[PDB]
Amino acid sequence: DSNNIKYVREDAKKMHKLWAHIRMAMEGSRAIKDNAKEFVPHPDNTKATTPEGVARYKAYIERAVWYGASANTVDGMLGQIFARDPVFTGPEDKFDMLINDVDGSGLSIHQQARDSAEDALSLGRGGLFVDYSARPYIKFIAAEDILNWRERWVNGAKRTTLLVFREESDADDDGYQIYKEEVWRELRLVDGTYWQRTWRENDGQLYVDDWISPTKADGSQFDEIPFVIFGSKNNDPTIDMPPMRDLVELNIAHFRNSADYEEACFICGQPTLFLSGLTEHWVKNVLGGAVVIGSRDAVPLPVNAKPELLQAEGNGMVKEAMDQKERQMVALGAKLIDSDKTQRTFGEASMEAAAQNSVLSRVSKNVSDAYTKALRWAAMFLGLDEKIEYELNSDFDINKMSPEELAAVISAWQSNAISFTEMRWQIKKGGRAYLEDEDMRNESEQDDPL
Amino acid sequence: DSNNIKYVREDAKKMHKLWAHIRMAMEGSRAIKDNAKEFVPHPDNTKATTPEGVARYKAYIERAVWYGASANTVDGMLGQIFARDPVFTGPEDKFDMLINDVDGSGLSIHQQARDSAEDALSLGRGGLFVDYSARPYIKFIAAEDILNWRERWVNGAKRTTLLVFREESDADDDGYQIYKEEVWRELRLVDGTYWQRTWRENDGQLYVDDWISPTKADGSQFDEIPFVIFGSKNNDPTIDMPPMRDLVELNIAHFRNSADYEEACFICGQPTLFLSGLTEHWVKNVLGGAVVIGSRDAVPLPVNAKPELLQAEGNGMVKEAMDQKERQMVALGAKLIDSDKTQRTFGEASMEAAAQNSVLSRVSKNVSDAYTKALRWAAMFLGLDEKIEYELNSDFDINKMSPEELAAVISAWQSNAISFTEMRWQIKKGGRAYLEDEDMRNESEQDDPL
Amino acid sequence: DSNNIKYVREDAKKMHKLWAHIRMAMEGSRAIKDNAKEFVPHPDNTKATTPEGVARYKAYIERAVWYGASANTVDGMLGQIFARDPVFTGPEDKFDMLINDVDGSGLSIHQQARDSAEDALSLGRGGLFVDYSARPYIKFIAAEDILNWRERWVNGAKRTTLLVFREESDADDDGYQIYKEEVWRELRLVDGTYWQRTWRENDGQLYVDDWISPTKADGSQFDEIPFVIFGSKNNDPTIDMPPMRDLVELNIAHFRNSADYEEACFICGQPTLFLSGLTEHWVKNVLGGAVVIGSRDAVPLPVNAKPELLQAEGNGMVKEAMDQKERQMVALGAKLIDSDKTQRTFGEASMEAAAQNSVLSRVSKNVSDAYTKALRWAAMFLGLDEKIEYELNSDFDINKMSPEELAAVISAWQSNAISFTEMRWQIKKGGRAYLEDEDMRNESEQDDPL
Numbered sequence A, B, C: 001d002s003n004n005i006k007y008v009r010e011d012a013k014k015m016h017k018l019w020a021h022i023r024m025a026m027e028g029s030r031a032i033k034d035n036a037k038e039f040v041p042h043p044d045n046t047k048a049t050t051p052e053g054v055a056r057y058k059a060y061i062e063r064a065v066w067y068g069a070s071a072n073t074v075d076g077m078l079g080q081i082f083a084r085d086p087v088f089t090g091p092e093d094k095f096d097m098l099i100n101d102v103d104g105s106g107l108s109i110h111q112q113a114r115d116s117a118e119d120a121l122s123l124g125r126g127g128l129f130v131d132y133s134a135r136p137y138i139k140f141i142a143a144e145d146i147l148n149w150r151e152r153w154v155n156g157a158k159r160t161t162l163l164v165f166r167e168e169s170d171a172d173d174d175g176y177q178i179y180k181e182e183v184w185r186e187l188r189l190v191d192g193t194y195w196q197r198t199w200r201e202n203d204g205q206l207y208v209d210d211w212i213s214p215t216k217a218d219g220s221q222f223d224e225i226p227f228v229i230f231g232s233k234n235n236d237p238t239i240d241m242p243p244m245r246d247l248v249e250l251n252i253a254h255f256r257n258s259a260d261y262e263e264a265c266f267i268c269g270q271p272t273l274f275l276s277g278l279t280e281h282w283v284k285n286v287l288g289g290a291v292v293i294g295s296r297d298a299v300p301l302p303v304n305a306k307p308e309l310l311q312a313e314g315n316g317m318v319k320e321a322m323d324q325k326e327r328q329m330v331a332l333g334a335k336l337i338d339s340d341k342t343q344r345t346f347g348e349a350s351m352e353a354a355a356q357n358s359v360l361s362r363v364s365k366n367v368s369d370a371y372t373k374a375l376r377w378a379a380m381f382l383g384l385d386e387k388i389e390y391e392l393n394s395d396f397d398i399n400k401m402s403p404e405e406l407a408a409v410i411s412a413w414q415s416n417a418i419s420f421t422e423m424r425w426q427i428k429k430g431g432r433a434y435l436e437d438e439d440m441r442n443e444s445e446q447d448d449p450l
Helices: A010-027 A029-034 A045-049 A051-062 A069-081 A093-100 A109-122 A245-268 A280-287 A317-331 A349-356 A358-382 A403-414 A420-429 A437-445 B010-027 B029-034 B045-049 B051-062 B069-081 B093-100 B109-122 B245-268 B280-287 B317-331 B349-356 B358-382 B403-414 B420-429 B437-445 C010-027 C029-034 C045-049 C051-062 C069-081 C093-100 C109-122 C245-268 C280-287 C317-331 C349-356 C358-382 C403-414 C420-429 C437-445
Strands: A087-089 A128-132 A136-138 A146-149 A162-169 A181-190 A193-202 A205-208 A389-391 B087-089 B128-132 B136-138 B146-149 B162-169 B181-190 B193-202 B205-208 B389-391 C087-089 C128-132 C136-138 C146-149 C162-169 C181-190 C193-202 C205-208 C389-391
Touching: A010 A029, A010 A069, A010 A245, A029 C245, A045 A051, A051 A245, A069 A109, A069 A245, A069 A358, A069 C349, A069 C358, A093 A109, A093 A358, A109 A358, A109 C358, A128 A358, A136 A358, A245 A317, A245 B029, A245 B245, A245 C245, A245 C317, A317 B245, A317 B317, A317 C317, A349 A358, A349 B069, A358 A389, A358 B069, A358 B109, A403 A420, A403 B403, A403 C403, A420 A437, A420 B437, A437 C420, B010 B029, B010 B069, B010 B245, B045 B051, B051 B245, B069 B109, B069 B245, B069 B358, B093 B109, B093 B358, B109 B358, B128 B358, B136 B358, B245 B317, B349 B358, B358 B389, B403 B420, B420 B437, C010 C029, C010 C069, C010 C245, C045 C051, C051 C245, C069 C109, C069 C245, C069 C358, C093 C109, C093 C358, C109 C358, C128 C358, C136 C358, C245 C317, C349 C358, C358 C389, C403 C420, C420 C437
Parallel strands: none
Antiparallel strands: A087 A389, A128 A136, A146 A162, A162 A181, A181 A193, A193 A205, B087 B389, B128 B136, B146 B162, B162 B181, B181 B193, B193 B205, C087 C389, C128 C136, C146 C162, C162 C181, C181 C193, C193 C205
């Protein structure tokens, strides 16, 4: 237990190891081979003590092959979730500053939502913070940055009273040398009132800021802390298990199996003559420490001499284990790899599509509610309309719409069952239109060319 | 038998072991390898006594591979049950505070329902509590928290008279150090009247609260305790067997088989020369404790010498047992893995879909009735309309609707057989509309663009 | 830490190695075999010390085969992303100078967008800079050129205050000898005002330029630096992991496996007679150091003599490892190779198309927003219309449209659902029209021939 602003909750420290392992898995092969001591055990500790043992271990690690399947799963999941663009409900001209630059850096809200979805898919944690500069800015807080939170029940309700997250920034000094200064934000909720302050560090000194109470345009300060923690499981301050832990462990096991297999292939993969029944006198007489192996020359041997080319044959049990691990990764609901040899009957996958896209749907809804809450807090800051929504693509397995589907949606719009904007969103989802609904209305208002 | 408020029923203590095992199964590989002593038996107790034996056992556990199939089953089951959003029947503006934040934390009722469904699918137990702060809050009580209950028949009826569940909270002290204080709620029913009190602990002292009787807006206090225990089997205080017990045991067995298989692959998987019929004189004369194995060099051997590369071949019976266990997990009605090689004829799975989604349907209905009862209790608290319903997605294997299906539902709506809101719910289930029914009505009220 | 304008950020130096490796992978086989020491380890360090060892290593590298699969993946990804031409939204006559020559070199904006997309697909980094000469020019800055940036938060917003990128140019001296002079651009943002200056080097001397503030046609100088860094992940100054790292490592591993396999094929691939049980007296008597191997002549041998043709058989485990690596590259979502033997059922790939084109879609959107921001900055420079857009082809797997699809889009245009220009863009995407919409309108305005 520590009273410093830098104090990190124990469960966050416990999950730091898994978070770091997942980050190395996402990074690629370089990070895996850098920390290969943690993943691949040394074949012999006695060798590890000696210098030649660690020299051999270095080549053992270098010859290994990293699949990089977890990164492929993350990329495929992001591509499935983020197709076309998330739909925003409500006024658009009154919220254009949030869509164009969500944090005043030129980055659209869609890119920040994509980053949040990637973080929630990979390690299953994130944060969104809304504050006032004038204009409101929607933050993006990495999972490792949120290092403290509290759940104190007020009048029999779940209320998050304390929440401290680390803010990182680059010092803009006169010189071009890159510095690194950190800011700590302390979000407090006393008797249903939001208070906040900032902590800064420089030369080992802690600078404190006076307590302030941000207030909406109408007033009444704030009843809740404008911070939402989104995860794979639910939007709760409690940590959720990352969805990629099992895939990461399977990838590590496959990596060590590949290290063993590559060592075996390097050593015993090359065929060797193995001239048995040979005498030194014969070697010096004819062979002379040199055997011609071309088809032009024939090599003689004495009586009862058996030459036998020896090399490790295929279908080794190490390769069998590697194939089993790859099959398990495919079977673990991961889009990490695709197989051309495998064939699937159409209509079979339609039954399982609900289960396969379970994590996709859960993350999509969680991020949707998180961003809806953030946008509502921003609207409160600006005193704008409250009934706004931000929903990501919840319809996965998206593809170009068929002519029959196009006729069906047109017929549905011609009846009072599908909204005109709903049909436009349908036709944009299928990659059949690009212009905005207002532009299409304006152009179709005039007479036909004929 | 104990008279303390902390007393736990004997059957709860008996089920605690299974609950903990299931929790470790959900957690992932780290928890499994942490408590590997409980799951994987030591290959030799005599070695376990010695230090080198436990040193070998550590590497034995580390080399193992955890499938993580039970977590995949839970995720797939949740994705199947929770598609789109649960439908709420009744006034919506008068219940908006419950939908937006069911417990005053910004968490929507849908997320809490998802968490309850996950708990009922994984270990098959949960609790919902409704209390008054002003506003009513619908609780979520974990299965391990409910530690005492009673079934005393009053006038020949099943009445739950006593129910004590542990309430956990974080102390909001001045410092940032995280504390941990617990609250005990004692729910009592005397002569058909609901009484409740809270118990708090600090510094080993028990603080007691005076008995209170919550009352509805109309009055008449309360006739029943506002607590419902939902499980996989039924909404009864009696404990129900978790649906994932058999899958957890199968996964543990596969994990120990994988430990054995990985040890065998590490040891005997690498091919070895095994130069038989070799004399020490020959070794020192030519070999000199160093054999060149590249294809460039040829190694000679004396007469009657047989070199034989030896390695464990594939299709081992341990691997056969692992494959059998994986097949059994697939066959146990688990969406834990999917196989691209396997092909299924369309229309065959339609016959079994009732049996495969049996646990899904049972959990869906149980949670639906639990949340309906909770919402009715909240309406009683607020004196609102009583004929309200909360039903989750009972139609599993959900996919995008076909153009023919769209035409069919439009034609059905054009007749007096499907409600307009029913057709809207149909078209939203198929991922063909996103706007609310009222918004569509308002936009279609005006004239066509033309 | 250095105060010079040439100072490079530490993370850029760290990523320089991966960037260089990816560049060698794109370059082809010559670059790979040039730096083969970094990729293919020497089979023996003791040999490497000796001159004959390095002589053997040279032939070892020369016999190797480079797949060149990463370059094929990049080319296929570019072809998928860049089909037809990117659509420009807004006035076209007022922006013709940017479309015809984006940087005043006759290179169309489409070619520069293609180059940016290639850079973002290969190593996942790039830059776009807009400056005033008069006319505005949209720059293209290679990833290695951006060597310094800063993220200083101003009023609680992400603002890029410093950004220094290297500008390379060829000296136009009187002679034809090629020189090489470099220019450094220092982009600074003080109190929300864009400042810039240029640094030049000649004969070891640094020439500095006075600080200037570019201003728009309307005025008000500039509020943000007209520089956008686009990457595979997002349009942020932070470096993003290249999407081709895993494929590059797999290709390197396959290259070293191919080196080993080719050496084995060269040495042990040729069959040899291996006349065992042969005496020197017999050799000199009949063989005489010359064996006739044609079918016309028969060669006699003494008693107990076994001739045995020996050669390395097929299905070697090295070849098995190479096949496994090729399969892994195919399965890693790479269009690097296609297999005629493999067959895929139609409709299966439609489900995975979202995941397979994930990196394609992400890069397409990132480059689209980057170029939209650049065009908006150019419009600010010229005081032109701001509501302009530049969107690349986000509909991948593009093919010629079917007659049924043509009828469907015509029917959709005949209704008020698809814009006339939208239908024209549809019919141009399907390769069914080439003339501009205005030309078609002008020709169809007149009466029919009949």
